[PDB]
UniProtKB/Swiss-Prot annotation:
The gene is ABCB1. This is ATP-dependent translocase ABCB1. Residues 335-571, 917-1155 form the ABC transporter domain. The lineage of its organism: Eukaryota, Metazoa, Chordata, Craniata, Vertebrata. ATP 2 binds at G952, S953, S954, G955, C956, G957, K958, S959. It catalyses: ATP + H2O + xenobioticSide 1 = ADP + phosphate + xenobioticSide 2; ATP + H2O + phospholipidSide 1 = ADP + phosphate + phospholipidSide 2; a 1,2-diacyl-sn-glycero-3-phosphoethanolamine(in) + ATP + H2O = a 1,2-diacyl-sn-glycero-3-phosphoethanolamine(out) + ADP + phosphate + H(+); a 1,2-diacyl-sn-glycero-3-phosphocholine(out) + ATP + H2O = a 1,2-diacyl-sn-glycero-3-phosphocholine(in) + ADP + phosphate + H(+). It is a multi-pass membrane protein. Its EC number is 7.6.2.2, 7.6.2.1. One of its GO terms (cellular component) is extracellular exosome.
Amino acid sequence: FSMFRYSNWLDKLYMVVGTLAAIIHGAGLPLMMLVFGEMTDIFANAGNNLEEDMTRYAYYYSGIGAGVLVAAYIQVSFWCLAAGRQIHKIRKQFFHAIMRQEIGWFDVHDVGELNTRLTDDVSKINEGIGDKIGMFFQSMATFFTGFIVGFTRGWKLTLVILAISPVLGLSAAVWAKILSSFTDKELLAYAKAGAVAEEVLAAIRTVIAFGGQKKELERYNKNLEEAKRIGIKKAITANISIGAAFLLIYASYALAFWYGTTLVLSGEYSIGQVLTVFFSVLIGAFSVGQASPSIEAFANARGAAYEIFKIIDNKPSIDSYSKSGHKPDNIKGNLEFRNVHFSYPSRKEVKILKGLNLKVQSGQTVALVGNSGCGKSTTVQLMQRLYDPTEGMVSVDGQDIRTINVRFLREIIGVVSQEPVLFATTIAENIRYGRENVTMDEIEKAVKEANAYDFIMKLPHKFDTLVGERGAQLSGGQKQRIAIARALVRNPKILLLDEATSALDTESEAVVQVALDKARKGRTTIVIAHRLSTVRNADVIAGFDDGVIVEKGNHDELMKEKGIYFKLVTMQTIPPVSFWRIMKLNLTEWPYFVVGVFCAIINGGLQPAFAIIFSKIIGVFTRIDDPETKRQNSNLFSLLFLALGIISFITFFLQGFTFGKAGEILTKRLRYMVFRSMLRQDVSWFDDPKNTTGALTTRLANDAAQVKGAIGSRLAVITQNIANLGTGIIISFIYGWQLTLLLLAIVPIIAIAGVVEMKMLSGQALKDKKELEGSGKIATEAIENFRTVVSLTQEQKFEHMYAQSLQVPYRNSLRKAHIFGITFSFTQAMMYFSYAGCFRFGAYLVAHKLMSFEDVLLVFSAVVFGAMAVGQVSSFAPDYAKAKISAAHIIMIIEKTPLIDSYSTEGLMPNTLEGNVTFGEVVFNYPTRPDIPVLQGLSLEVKKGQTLALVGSSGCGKSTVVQLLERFYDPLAGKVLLDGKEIKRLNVQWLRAHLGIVSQEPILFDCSIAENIAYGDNSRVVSQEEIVRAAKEANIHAFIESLPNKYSTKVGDKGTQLSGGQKQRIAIARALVRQPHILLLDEATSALDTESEKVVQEALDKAREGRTCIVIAHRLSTIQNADLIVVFQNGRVKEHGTHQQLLAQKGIYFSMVSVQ
Ligand SMILES: COc1ccc(CCN(C)CCC[C@](C#N)(c2ccc(OC)c(OC)c2)C(C)C)cc1OC
Ligand SMILES: Nc1ncnc2c1ncn2[C@@H]1O[C@H](COP(=O)(O)OP(=O)(O)OP(=O)(O)O)[C@@H](O)[C@H]1O
Ligand SMILES: Nc1ncnc2c1ncn2[C@@H]1O[C@H](COP(=O)(O)OP(=O)(O)OP(=O)(O)O)[C@@H](O)[C@H]1O
Ligand SMILES: [Mg+2]
Ligand SMILES: [Mg+2]
């Protein structure tokens, strides 16, 4: 698919113009470098009126700069405009094709997947075809023209440098590869801690219940230590990579200078040729290096566009836009289904359509009946030509549906949905979606007919009341009535309705049926319902039989047939922070920083040195003296580069280690704190949806690289850049003030250029995303509702709406492209103009003997290359912004304290528990929904060694009394006391330990069963004999013994490797491990291996002595086996007493007992 662009041949011309502009820019840059070589050559010749020659050279520079400006502007602007046009056209085509797809197609592919496809794949195509291609062409042109210039102006020096450059390229690529490998290794290493934390957090309730936080913390600490080791290895790898790159480039500089000095000293081509060839070839090498991102982006776009086109290329089986069918004018009611054989393509194996015979005459209110899953609604669905008949015949008025206008057919048949979908627009908007030619008079008549006026009239702008998100504005009965009105507005020839009002309420069903069946003489009707009333009104009713109709007759005929109809009838009855505070790594890295900065400063001083040293290697030739001594002097500088490069390397190496450790240590310590901080938190905190277990895990994981960068990387980059630029500026001022001042006041233009470019890129991205979302609202609202859309045959109208929503931001995109192109062209031409002005001024000074030409080169190179290196390093280190906000979030979380400090040693800790509990007036309001109280201040009490049972209502806090008993919260109002001990005053540790809570679905860590059982008895060692005794008590010791490896078996995740009953028994045994004085069990019986469940319940009862057990269950006999029972009614204790007294009374307990 090398040619994946297919739109607007004129756009092809625009793209070719952009390509030519890219070639021009690429050729231009080394052309500027060659002109620099010539200027240097003339400057050196002047070592003996020069100003004129300098002015001529400056004129050449200005011409090339203007050419560069125009060429870069053309490149970026033309490519971006072409991309905008291409993306607009392809997005329109893609949405239209999606609308064209078949119902089966949309069913097969996930709707969310396709919506995300539209949202993201097109944008990725744009990004990979927008401008990066222009950059690729420009880089290729720069490489080729650099080589051409090097060859033209030199043969030997060019050859040596071209033979050297691949070494540097290979070294850089190899270092990148090893860095990526180390990245993968570090990810895999930390995955262990990640899994540990995920398991712990997923079991936060049980984790806090068993007080095993310490063990999990220790394991996480060990994993974190391993991950820190690997991360430090990665950091040293990356830093040594950068150092090796610096060493290679400086070695290239040194060898180039040595060879060039050898040549020029030999009377060969002058120094200017050396400078031009060296710089041009080096720039070519770096550009061919920079080429890669464009290729990567284009490959990603290749893949995405391949998928998109494959979606587009698929010609559908049914083409709603195709008008190759016959469109009769007068439609006479006559429906024929003959041996309709077919199935759901989703699972073609089944055959729901097992052939069907049915003939309906005109003006018949036919109806279908049958058991759920008999395909009664599938017949109607096929009636709309939503699917195709695998083997059979379907026709209306004696003509095959396939041989008729698909769009016309679908618009000549009206349908009603059991759960109608309504377009998220005004009531008038919804009616228009139903049909635009309503004239608003028949619309009002239909609105009146459907009996939907109260909801419409009450709402603001009665006839134009909008529908909120997902139809929350109107009522379900209102929604059904609106749907019926919309269907009727089309005045179809065949109505197909299912569950008119059989979803939630029947009150509006009477009016709905009255209005629907009222006007059906000229509109044949198919009705699917689930109530006897709707069945009775049927005129001709057909019963379904395995996708076949056996019973066919009226109500009386069906009743006399004694079919399934009669069977049913009888059965029918972002806080901020301070950089000073954030530097917590002081406690750790204080011995580290002093090293790194010292190294970093040296590196900051390394680059400016290269300037002055380089300057001297030029100055040595500019001097008229030029004796043989220079041959020695050149060496004195040449080898320096080599040594200099080593220095450049060496510091980084050291800098890698120290800082690599400094950050790495933090990654450990911070984690070891934050996770702990998370554990020392109340259950309510986790209850917040924001603190989602997965989200908390990710934050615990995806923050090391953020905080490390914010603390260390930011400081290192700031010190390095500051040292480098300050050294350069100060040295320049020492050796020059005029050119120094001009350059210092000119560089900020470049700084503004770069900053504005980045800011414009970010802002344009955000704005484009915003407008794209504005259009995607319409797109998704017209994709998630695809079935009802095709039923409405309004696809074209939604296509026009999306076309408008895209035309709105298309112009904005084009204008943004133009603006970005102009800004980029200015940024690129600024450097050329600055070189022109700086060298013109340098001549204007040296001619007046104000500054040595060597001094001019010194100042220029120092300042400009310092700016370049500073920008590069700044763009190298991790971003401060995201790192800063991540540090803020983690600081907020770690510093945040709980309302109940489980680690607080103070608290009433009586030696022994009395087994007395009294919960009175305890009002429970969950922090998730504090406006929805769950406990109504119920009243209850249990004595020592007393077994109580609950009769709470569904989702009324029946089990919450254990939850509150678990101390996972605090009583909002009222009181709960244990053995006359203040629950608030009771130490959280002691209370949590002394209670044997049993959860409704007790989770277990995926480790050895021995550890899982042992972990319950925290704060002490539980001998294997105690574990065996507990397992026998829970009736699990025998099962474990039969299991190979006994208690050492690696229990599968969530206990999957073991039977659910086995897992519950293991959890009960663990609970019994702590020999709890007061215990709680919640829905532990269910059915649960009814024999095994009964055995477990019997064992628990046998071990109920010497402990008070609070039991919540759905088994009648277990509740009766309790010592006492407490009823619940909206959080109110209706009654409390024994089984006999409770049953005798008229209380809900008797009815519940009679239920089973
Ligand atoms: C990266 O793109 C460019 C590269 C070079 C140039 C101009 C001429 N260069 C020979 C000097 C600048 C590049 C420079 C060197 N040498 C350099 C850049 C990046 C580096 O990190 C990989 C580096 O150290 C290895 C050195 C100097 C900053 C010290 C302009 C550029 O902008 C287009
Ligand atoms: N996308 C689907 N792919 C496969 N089977 C499906 C799909 N949607 C529904 N089904 C099932 O296929 C059968 C089609 O039944 P259909 O609804 O058309 O008729 P019905 O007699 O009114 O039954 P029901 O209303 O209980 O589904 C049902 O068993 C339904 O659950
Ligand atoms: N952390 C929480 N935040 C908000 N609501 C909660 C929370 N935990 C439970 N609930 C709600 O409290 C009720 C659960 O209480 P409880 O389990 O004691 O009653 P239940 O009758 O045994 O429950 P179920 O009918 O679910 O088996 C449900 O409404 C549940 O939505
Ligand atoms: Mg159905
Ligand atoms: Mg419950």
